[PDB]
Structure 1
Amino acid sequence: ELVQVLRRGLQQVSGHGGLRGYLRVLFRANDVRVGTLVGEDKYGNKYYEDNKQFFGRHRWVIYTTEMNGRDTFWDVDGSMVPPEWHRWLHCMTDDP
């Protein structure tokens, strides 16, 4: 079952838009998982879902690189999430 995990890693590499996208998501979030896209903000944040992860890892956001006035390629924080996706992300509701 080793070849299975190696192929899943290769699929994660290929599913992020190539090697450059893989390193982008590796250095921007320290996480290279691939999930189902749920939606996108008007500010650029992308929201993904994977119900096979345990409670806490089944929902996550990929933050935008440029919010209202600042460059957020490296400087991201939890306060950049808009209220509706804040409610969805913290599992206060099951509906995006």
Structure 2
Amino acid sequence: ELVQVLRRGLQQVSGHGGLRGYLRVLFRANDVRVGTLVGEDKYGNKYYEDNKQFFGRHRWVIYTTEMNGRDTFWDVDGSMVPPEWHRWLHCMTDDP
């Protein structure tokens, strides 16, 4: 079953668009999990869910690299989420 988890890791590498995207998501979010895309903002934030994860890790957001005027490739904060995706991301509701 070790081969199974290693193959899962290889597929995690492949599901982020190659080594470059895998390393980008590893160095930006410190996480390489692959989820189902729920939607995208008009600012560029992407939203993913994976219901097999325990409560708290089953929803997440990959932040945009460029908000109104600042470069947010490295400097991201939780206040960049618009109110509707704020409601969805904090589990105040079930409907995106």
TM-score (norm 2): 1.00
Q: What is the identity percentage for the equivalent residue pairs of Structure 1 and Structure 2?
A: 100
Give how far 1:25 is off. 0.1
Give how far 1:92 is off. 0.1
1:55 aligned residue: 55
Instruction: Could you tell me which runs of 5 or more consecutive residues in structure 1 were left unpaired when the two chains were aligned.
Output: none
Give how far 1:34 is off. 0.1
1:15 aligned residue: 15
Q: Which runs of 4+ in 1 moved over 2 A?
A: none
TM-score (norm 1): 1.00
Distance 2:87 2:25 in 1: 24
How many aligned residue pairs are there?
96
After superposition, give the CA deviation of every residue in 1:28-63 in whole Å (9 maximum; x if it has no partner).
Answer: 000000000000000000000000000000000000
Give how far 1:75 is off. 0.3
The RMSD of aligned alpha carbons is 0.2
Instruction: Could you tell me which runs of 5 or more consecutive residues in structure 2 were left unpaired when the two chains were aligned.
Output: none
